[PDB]
Amino acid sequence: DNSYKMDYPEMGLCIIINNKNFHKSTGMTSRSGTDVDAANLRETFRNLKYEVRNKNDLTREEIVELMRDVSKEDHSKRSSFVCVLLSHGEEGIIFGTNGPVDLKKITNFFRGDRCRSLTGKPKLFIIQACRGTELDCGIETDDDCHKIPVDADFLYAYSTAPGYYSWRNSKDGSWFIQSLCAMLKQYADKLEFMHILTRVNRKVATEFESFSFDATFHAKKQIPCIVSMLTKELYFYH
């Protein structure tokens, strides 16, 4: 039992929150290209056998509400849980159309003590959003009851390092989401999740570089950030 039981009747839900248009009141640009991201995740997770539910342009409130309701579902027959957040953001924050939401609030609904039908099951959060304004210019090449931690079995696949900008191309989508999808399509049938995510790290880090008319944003790099509290290996098959 080094790997998670992934032979339940259902793989699980894959909730995609796709925020494209924001309230002018926030002073935030449209996320051109995010639809391509959404469509790619949908098809990719569909082939993995996940029940996909897309949600477009949700308010901070709608996001909290969506997450609460989903955490209140009976996941007993589901192997895992995937949530993908596509939006603007800051460190520890994701933006609804009308304002920011703490990631901690979203993930808390899924704590091992608050979502009992998911206790002991992998809970994946995939987040394409900025975590700050830093830019990366790159470099040329005894005692033994039987409790488990409530923050355990979480995996947070971040599109970028803490404090840094996250890059999104207007026609093809975010660097991170395109690479994740591609790596999943190529390797989900043979590789452990962590290893697949390392391939993504590499692809994003080597194959992408920003091009901008504005010197300040031109020739920048990006590295994704895998944050794992998983206690087992994850394979998308059996």
Added chain:
Amino acid sequence: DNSYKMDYPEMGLCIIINNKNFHKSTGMTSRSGTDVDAANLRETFRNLKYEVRNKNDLTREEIVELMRDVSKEDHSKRSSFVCVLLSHGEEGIIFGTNGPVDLKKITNFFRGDRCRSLTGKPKLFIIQACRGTELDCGIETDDDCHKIPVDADFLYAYSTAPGYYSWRNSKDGSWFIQSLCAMLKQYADKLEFMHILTRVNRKVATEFESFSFDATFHAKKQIPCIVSMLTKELYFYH
């Protein structure tokens, strides 16, 4: 080339900063047991063929200094770099004997742009320290400049989740370090680093629970936190 080149003439340095006694002026307890931690890491890393250098009770200044100097070495002939910080801490902070140091300051010396002999080489930071005061009560069971990001090829193996306390036993050491060492001893010859670190996560999360005379700190759990910006697989052999 899915895995890091680990056949250089030397595996690399393994710096262990072991802070046990702090200045009264800080109002911080001695870290009873940390010596067991230090001794175990030394032995474990020695078997892995790492050049181990232990440093006891360093000041915030002495730490900055140690790191500067080590980043200024010629690591051309080294496959990797390991740094282990054993001390009190807070989110993003590690304490010297006389005060706190920002982790970012420590790791920045090793950025791909500031330590050219480690560019493209895995830089591991293993950290036994608190990240806050939260407690875990648990639950019963086109376009192609060939740059890479400067923040890439880093791995931060945190003893605990963000915001949380990290547990250390007076006679046997920290829960995290004892488990890391054991897992390295058992699996370093066959398993990829990430997978080993996942075993650690499991061991800590299942086999450990606090026991305290004070209800506030009794029966608590802990989950470690793997943070990976690696672009390749890491094996401690070849």
